[PDB]
Amino acid sequence: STKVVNVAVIGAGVVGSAFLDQLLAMKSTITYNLVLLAEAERSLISKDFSPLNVGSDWKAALAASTTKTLPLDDLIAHLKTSPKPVILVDNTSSAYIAGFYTKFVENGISIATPNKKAFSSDLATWKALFSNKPTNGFVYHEATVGAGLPIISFLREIIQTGDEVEKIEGIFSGTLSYIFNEFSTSQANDVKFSDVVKVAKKLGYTEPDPRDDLNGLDVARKVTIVGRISGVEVESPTSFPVQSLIPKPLESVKSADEFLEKLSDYDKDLTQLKKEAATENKVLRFIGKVDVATKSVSVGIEKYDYSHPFASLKGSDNVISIKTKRYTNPVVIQGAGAGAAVTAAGVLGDVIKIAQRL
Amino acid sequence: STKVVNVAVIGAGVVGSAFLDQLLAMKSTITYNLVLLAEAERSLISKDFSPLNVGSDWKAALAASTTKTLPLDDLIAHLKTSPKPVILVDNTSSAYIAGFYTKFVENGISIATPNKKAFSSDLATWKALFSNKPTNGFVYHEATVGAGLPIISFLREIIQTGDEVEKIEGIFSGTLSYIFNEFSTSQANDVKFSDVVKVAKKLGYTEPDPRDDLNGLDVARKVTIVGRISGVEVESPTSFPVQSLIPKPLESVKSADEFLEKLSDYDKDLTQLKKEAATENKVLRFIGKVDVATKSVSVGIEKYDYSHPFASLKGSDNVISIKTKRYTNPVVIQGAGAGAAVTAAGVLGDVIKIAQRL
Ligand SMILES: NC(=O)c1ccc[n+]([C@@H]2O[C@H](COP(=O)([O-])OP(=O)(O)OC[C@H]3O[C@@H](n4cnc5c(N)ncnc54)[C@H](O)[C@@H]3O)[C@@H](O)[C@H]2O)c1
Ligand code: NA
Ligand code: NA
């Protein structure tokens, strides 16, 4: 519905710029007018709400802008006056922006985003975002868990029709999936955890500092989200057991490059844990888990039989196994769970779901 | 104020019945009014367009009605009269009703359905899926391929995003998935093809006459749908290779129930193939296949290694493997692809998409 929608983009980084390219080249019966292109420093803004005149080369326009990005209270005071429904696309991982979601929604502005923040913080924030009071903006966050795979929309659809989630488990980290798919295979191999890690870092399958992947916070925020969708009132990303791969108190002691070279000093444990699993004919994988019956959520290493689909993941795919009252046999979804184009497409897909809803 | 959508249902069988229950139970910010229900010669029609007063038990109310079922032309006329957008839900498998789809849509009546007829006939009939006219209802057929799994919506989504499907292949028949799951397994099986069908027949996991499942026509039906969505203009479900499982030229004979009793005479070929695959650590599966580059579509048996996702299916499960420009590694979606509840949930899932879009 509404043949004309205004899109307000925040974020022009790795995911953000692919998103912009996809949004600006998309052909549809619905007209999507870009009215904001904000970055940390500069920002493009249509005071008019008419489409920003950038053709398909927004980078030169943005680079040439000396207008400072508006503080969110100012941005909303402006966007709320749009003559057509507005959709905020938050392509950042900003706590600051996330902190403003509720005010966006309350001002009738919808949100499409991969930012996990607002969905993995306060439990009241969460409820406020999905209240759907009249005229308030709709909030879509498909890309928060599983990038562009059809996961969250599928869960929400299912729950709406009356189905009930009972158990979920999955590998929601592309970096950790890669590491384990390499570190623990069916074939017995004496590969060290430290070697795989720094190898992953060199190939670039890691955040600049691998510790931002090994701590499990990323996977913990995603399970917080999936758990709450499943009806488990998870308090926070740290209110349940989250097994960190960062070697014990030798953690918040080091500093980047130090951590890496210092890591090899612990391959002992994982080598022996992997061995015991190779005894029980299982492999090690890093998972996120939800159990609604027991209202128990968790993150960490778990063993999986060689037959299990988790042991045959290709590359660094993500996977979610979903058991509900109706799907007694698991619904299993695999595929890239990260990557610029695929993640931006999931966000774009969310923009399309909102555009038809408005 | 509250958005309202009137729902008109045709068919209260295994699926429709689950659909109706789910519909009357669902709680949403949008109000769905059941304004018409038709099953065989009995219909419940709210001449008022107010929600049918089915009290608690809609079955008892349907059975009590003395209102005859309206010819389709009179049904359309009546529906055009509704004060609110109407969504027709065809829970039949009728090629006759299917034949009236165009009339419904060009008259502003939307459609949600598990009925594959209209989508798997000739190509020109399929082309009539785009709102050539601005007063055209929508057409959703999610449950036509893979029950309630997120397949068709996912395919259409990424395509809109700019992605391009290159290859697809999956198990699309619940019955045939069940049969091959019993017949060809990883753990040294030994059952006769003959026996797998006879039992699937008694449990009612196959059409009253399993030949309608073995001729492979149904998967060809769903392949025609997927292939079209993928940009391959499949002429019809019989314009491409389809491997039939009804024993050689010894099908166009039997009086039907005769078939089952004479089937045990040909378990040889498949028993051989079965053994061979096992010898190779592979399993046998009946699949559908589409290749967009070569515009090649087909269905039939294929072998898969024990660790392959197509070897992890349970009972009536089915799967689809999608390789796209962005997903070099396929995203694989699996789970129940048949069954009252899950299918009805797929249809209601579409009813909800349409309602939000209206
Ligand atoms: N990189 C991946 O593979 C991947 C996979 C899934 C999800 N994500 C998520 O996608 C989002 C985008 O990540 P990314 O890789 O593009 O990060 P990035 O750092 O490359 O881009 C972030 C952008 O946000 C801008 N920004 C930050 N704070 C801002 C503010 N207050 N106002 C305006 N602009 C602001 C930055 O200037 C930058 O252009 C994050 O939420 C990330 O967690 C990333
Ligand atoms: Na996702
Ligand atoms: Na489906």
- In chain A, which residues have their Cβ closer than 8 Å to the Cβ of B349? 157-158, 160-161
**Contact assignment for A356 to B356 by CB distance below 8 Å:** yes
CA distances for B156 relative to A24, A318, A353, B24, B323, angstroms:
18, 21, 12, 29, 14
**Contact assignment for B352 to A160 by CB distance below 8 Å:** yes
Query: If we measure between CA atoms, which residue out of B207, B344, B234 comes closest to residue B288?
Result: B234
**Breaks in chain B listed by the residue before each, with C–N > 2.5 Å:** none
Q: Is A142 annotated as a binding residue?
A: yes
In the annotation, is B201 catalytic?
A: no
Instruction: Name the experimental technique.
Output: X-ray
CA angle A195, A196, A198 (to 5 degrees): 65
User: Rounded to an integer, what distance in angstroms lies between the CA atom of residue A299 and that of residue A289?
Assistant: 6
Q: Is B173 annotated as a binding residue?
A: no
Q: 């789910």: which residue's tokens?
A: B22
Which residue puts its alpha carbon closest to atom 15 of ligand 1? A14
A173 lines ligand 1 (CB under 6 A): no
Neighbours of ion ligand 3 (CB under 5 A): B 142, 146, 149, 151
- What structural domains and CATH numbers belong to chain A? 1-160+336-358 (3.40.50.720), 161-335 (3.30.360.10)
Contact residues for A335 (Cβ-Cβ < 8 A; gap 6+): A146, A149, A317, A318, A319, B327, B329, B330, B331, B332
**Tokens read off for B226:** 């997927």
Q: How far is A118 from chain B (nearest CA, A)?
A: 23
AA letter at B267: D
Per-position b or e across A326-336, b if 16+ CB within 10 A of its CB: bbeebbbbbbb
**Contact assignment for A161 to B327 by CB distance below 8 Å:** no
A9 lines ligand 1 (CB under 6 A): no
Q: How far is A146 from chain B (nearest CA, A)?
A: 11
User: What angle in degrees, to the nearest 10, is found between the helix axes of A340-357 and B340-357?
Assistant: 70
A94 lines ligand 1 (CB under 6 A): yes
Ligand 1 centroid vs A114 CA: distance in angstroms?
9
Q: Is B231 left (phi over 0), alpha (psi -120 to 50) or beta?
A: left
Total Cβ atoms within 10 A of residue B60: 10
**Contact assignment for A312 to B309 by CB distance below 8 Å:** yes
A93 lines ligand 1 (CB under 6 A): yes
Are the C-beta atoms of residues A37 and A58 closer than 8 Å to each other? yes
- DSSP letters of A251-282? STTS-THHHHHHHGGGHHHHHHHHHHHTTTTE
Helices (H), A83-162: 95-98, 101-106, 123-129, 152-161
A13 lines ligand 1 (CB under 6 A): yes
A14 lines ligand 1 (CB under 6 A): yes
**Contact assignment for B335 to A331 by CB distance below 8 Å:** yes
User: Rounded to an integer, what distance in angstroms lies between the CA atom of residue A135 and that of residue B1?
Assistant: 9
Are the C-beta atoms of residues B145 and B225 closer than 8 Å to each other? yes
Mutation site, A135, A136, A155, A161, interface B, largest B CB count within 10 A? A161
Q: How far is B344 from chain A (nearest CA, A)?
A: 9
What DSSP character marks residue A242?
Answer: B
Per-position b or e across B199-223, b if 16+ CB within 10 A of its CB: ebbeeebbeeebbebbbbbbbbbbb
Per-position b or e across B247-259, b if 16+ CB within 10 A of its CB: beeeeeebeeeeb
User: Rounded to an integer, what distance in angstroms lies between the CA atom of residue A200 and that of residue A204?
Assistant: 6
Mutation site, B157, B171, B186, interface A, largest A CB count within 10 A? B157
Ligand 3 centroid vs B145 CA: distance in angstroms?
5
Chains A, B: CB contacts within 8 A come to: 129
- In chain B, which residues have their Cβ closer than 8 Å to the Cβ of A326? 336, 339, 341-342, 345
Ligand 1 centroid vs A117 CA: distance in angstroms?
12
Ligand 2 centroid vs B186 CA: distance in angstroms?
32
**Contact assignment for A161 to B349 by CB distance below 8 Å:** yes
Using CB atoms within 10 Å of the CB of residue B233, give its burial: 0 to 12 exposed, 13 to 18 middle, 19+ buried: exposed
CA distances for B219 relative to B172, B242, B291, angstroms:
6, 9, 16
Residue of A nearest to B349 (CA): A157
Are the C-beta atoms of residues B104 and B133 closer than 8 Å to each other? no
User: Rounded to an integer, what distance in angstroms lies between the CA atom of residue B157 and that of residue A218?
Assistant: 26
Using CB atoms within 10 Å of the CB of residue B270, give its burial: 0 to 12 exposed, 13 to 18 middle, 19+ buried: buried
Ligand 2 centroid vs A143 CA: distance in angstroms?
4
Dihedral (Cα; A230, A233, A235, A240), 10-degree rounding: -60
Residue of A nearest to B352 (CA): A157
User: Rounded to an integer, what distance in angstroms lies between the CA atom of residue B355 and that of residue B5?
Assistant: 6
- In chain A, which residues have their Cβ closer than 8 Å to the Cβ of B153? 150, 153
Residue of B nearest to A332 (CA): B334
Ligand 3 centroid vs B149 CA: distance in angstroms?
4
Q: Is A197 annotated as a binding residue?
A: no
Contact residues for A161 (Cβ-Cβ < 8 A; gap 6+): B22, B26, B344, B345, B348, B349, B352
Closest CB to B157 among A161, A163, A352: A352
Catalytic residue numbers of A, as ranges: 222
Which one of B222, B282, B289, B303 is the catalytic residue? B222
User: Rounded to an integer, what distance in angstroms lies between the CA atom of residue A346 and that of residue A153?
Assistant: 11
Query: If we measure between CA atoms, which residue out of B357, B326, B321, B327 comes closest to residue B149?
Result: B321
A88 lines ligand 1 (CB under 6 A): no
Which residue puts its alpha carbon closest to atom 11 of ligand 1? A92
- In chain B, which residues have their Cβ closer than 8 Å to the Cβ of A341? 326
Mutate to test the pocket of ligand 1, among A93, A97, A205, A342 (most ligand atoms within 8 A of CB): A93
- In chain B, which residues have their Cβ closer than 8 Å to the Cβ of A18? none
Are the C-beta atoms of residues B324 and B164 closer than 8 Å to each other? yes
Q: Is A85 left (phi over 0), alpha (psi -120 to 50) or beta?
A: beta
- DSSP collapsed to 3 states, B212-242: HHHCCHHHHHHHHHHHHHCCCCCCCCCCCCE
Q: How far is B345 from chain A (nearest CA, A)?
A: 6
Q: Is B36 annotated as a binding residue?
A: no
Total Cβ atoms within 10 A of residue A39: 18
Residue of A nearest to B134 (CA): A29
Query: If we measure between CA atoms, which residue out of A187, A193, A233 comes closest to residue A213?
Result: A193
